[PDB]
Write an enzyme that holds these catalytic residues in place. Structure first.
Site, short mmCIF file in Angstrom:
data_model
loop_
_atom_site.label_atom_id
_atom_site.label_comp_id
_atom_site.label_asym_id
_atom_site.label_seq_id
_atom_site.Cartn_x
_atom_site.Cartn_y
_atom_site.Cartn_z
N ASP A 278 103.91 -30.44 74.12
CA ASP A 278 102.62 -31.24 73.71
C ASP A 278 102.84 -33.06 73.79
O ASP A 278 102.28 -32.85 72.58
CB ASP A 278 102.18 -30.45 72.62
CG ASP A 278 100.67 -30.16 72.75
OD1 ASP A 278 99.55 -30.55 74.09
OD2 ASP A 278 99.35 -30.36 71.22
N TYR B 55 94.25 -25.51 67.41
CA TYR B 55 94.75 -23.78 65.90
C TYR B 55 95.03 -24.45 64.45
O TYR B 55 95.60 -23.66 63.90
CB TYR B 55 95.23 -23.17 67.03
CG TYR B 55 94.92 -22.58 68.38
CD1 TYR B 55 93.99 -21.82 68.07
CD2 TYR B 55 95.40 -23.60 69.45
CE1 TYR B 55 93.09 -21.39 69.58
CE2 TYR B 55 94.56 -22.00 70.46
CZ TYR B 55 93.99 -21.82 70.68
OH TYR B 55 93.02 -21.05 71.96
N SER B 56 94.35 -25.96 64.11
CA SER B 56 95.04 -26.03 62.83
C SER B 56 93.51 -27.49 62.42
O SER B 56 93.23 -27.73 62.94
CB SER B 56 96.08 -26.90 62.51
OG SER B 56 95.99 -27.62 63.08
N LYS C 190 97.96 -29.30 56.95
CA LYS C 190 97.97 -28.43 57.70
C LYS C 190 97.70 -27.08 58.02
O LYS C 190 98.57 -26.25 57.69
CB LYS C 190 99.10 -28.62 59.28
CG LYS C 190 98.79 -27.77 60.29
CD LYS C 190 100.05 -27.73 62.06
CE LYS C 190 99.87 -28.13 62.82
NZ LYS C 190 101.44 -28.03 63.49
#
Ligand SMILES: CCc1ccccc1-c1ccc(CNCCc2nc3ccccc3[nH]2)cc1C(F)(F)F
Ligand SMILES: CCc1ccccc1-c1ccc(CNCCc2nc3ccccc3[nH]2)cc1C(F)(F)F
Ligand SMILES: CCc1ccccc1-c1ccc(CNCCc2nc3ccccc3[nH]2)cc1C(F)(F)F
EC number: 2.7.11.1
Length: 327
Positions: free
Chosen positions: A154, A48-49, A66
């Site tokens: 993550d 999501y970046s 970012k």
């Protein structure tokens, strides 16, 4: 219902912190000036970046920008809070500024520039010593963030930037990271499929820092056996089937019995029955130079179903696998 669990280390770090430190909603926004930055080239992406190399025009310094997509944008305060708590910590990416595009209202995080050796170059050239050295650098980051009451959630090769020329490593993308609070039930939809711990796959919510130690083991198995990813599941159920075909079904059932975990009723049909596989089954002529009895003993101590039985980041740093690393 399920049996409760707590981390064996850094259990109470977040209780020493004051109240209202937790109430971050329209609190310390502090936007910088977007006009200070000129985008130069795209470096890559997160889930999501979108990440760019940029120039700070007030001082001509290289930076990393970012740009957050809506899913990551919604949790920006937590990512900001975590990056700020860890700033200056060993091998942690440095947050330098927070900006917003006035046209689209999309936010972006600005970081210290870090070189990122190409993945193809790294895969073919890292030696047995390089793997031990970089794994020890990642453990310094994990021990630091775990000591500060934070779980990354993550850990994977994509979230590890290596500047091989300067032997420098950074642990990045703290967008899924969270504060560990004993007894808290967390969302199991974290990490990336291939790196999800058995606790996540069996919906055991009361997890802790040990989840990062599982993901680190998956990463290590990939590096030493040259098999990417090591556990290649088609979905979350099959992911646990891939793990059980290596760790075996007997230790999995001892794990679910210990925590009183209830599985999907069709569990026997997809899990089957599997013996523990010998690590030597993954060893061949192309990866034998990266495998040692110490490497396998270390992998064995990380890749355990029982999250409480895994090495902590500090115990991992004590392992014989790291005896040849210059400390
Ligand atoms: C299976 C991985 C592997 C096996 C054997 C030897 C090296 C690698 C490897 C290979 C590549 C990388 C570097 N990862 C960073 C990738 C990256 N670039 C980005 C650009 C923008 C945003 C995020 C980014 N993440 C790290 C690694 C690592 F960390 F050593 F595992
Ligand atoms: C749209 C990208 C974005 C997404 C999310 C947050 C901020 C921005 C952004 C927004 C604006 C700028 C700075 N833009 C300056 C462009 C410019 N340079 C000029 C030079 C001469 C004349 C006009 C000029 N206009 C930099 C950025 C940056 F660098 F991405 F952060
Ligand atoms: C309290 C509900 C219950 C009562 C009796 C028997 C099973 C459950 C149960 C218990 C948990 C879950 C959630 N999913 C389990 C996670 C999981 N991962 C698997 C991986 C492989 C095989 C089975 C798997 N099950 C779903 C269920 C479900 F769907 F209700 F059956």
């Amino acid at each position: 219902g399920p049996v409760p669990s707590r981390a064996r280390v850094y259990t109470d770090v977040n209780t020493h912190r004051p109240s209202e430190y937790w109430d971050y909603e329209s609190h310390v926004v502090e936007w910088g000036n977007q006009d200070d930055y000129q985008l130069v080239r795209k470096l890559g992406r997160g889930k999501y970046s979108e990440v760019f190399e940029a120039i700070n025009i007030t001082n001509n310094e290289k930076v990393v920008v970012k740009i957050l997509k809506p899913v990551a944008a919604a949790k920006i305060k937590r990512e900001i809070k975590i990056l700020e708590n860890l700033r200056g910590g060993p091998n942690i990416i440095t947050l330098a500024d927070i900006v917003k595009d006035p046209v689209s209202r999309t936010p972006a995080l600005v970081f210290e520039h870090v070189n990122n050796t190409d993945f193809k170059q790294l895969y073919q050239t890292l030696t047995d010593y390089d793997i031990r050295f970089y794994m020890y650098e990642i453990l310094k980051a994990l021990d630091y963030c775990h000591s500060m009451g934070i779980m990354h959630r993550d850990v994977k090769p994509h979230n590890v930037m290596i500047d091989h020329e300067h032997r420098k490593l950074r642990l990045i993308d703290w967008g899924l990271a969270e504060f560990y609070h004993p007894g808290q039930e967390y969302n199991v939809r974290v990490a990336s499929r291939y790196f999800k711990g058995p606790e996540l796959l069996v919906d055991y919510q009361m997890y802790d820092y040990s989840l990062d130690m599982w993901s680190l083991g998956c990463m290590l198995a990939s590096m030493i056996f040259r098999k990417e990813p090591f556990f290649h599941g088609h979905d979350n159920y099959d992911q646990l089937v891939r793990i059980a075909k290596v760790l075996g079904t007997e230790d999995l059932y001892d794990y679910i019995d210990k925590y009183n975990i209830e599985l999907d009723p069709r569990f026997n049909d997809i899990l089957g029955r599997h013996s523990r596989k010998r690590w030597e089954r993954f060893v061949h002529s192309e990866n034998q130079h990266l495998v040692s009895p110490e490497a396998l003993d270390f992998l064995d101590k990380l890749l355990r179903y029982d999250h409480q039985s895994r090495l902590t980041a500090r115990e991992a740093m004590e392992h014989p696998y790291f005896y040849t690393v210059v400390k």
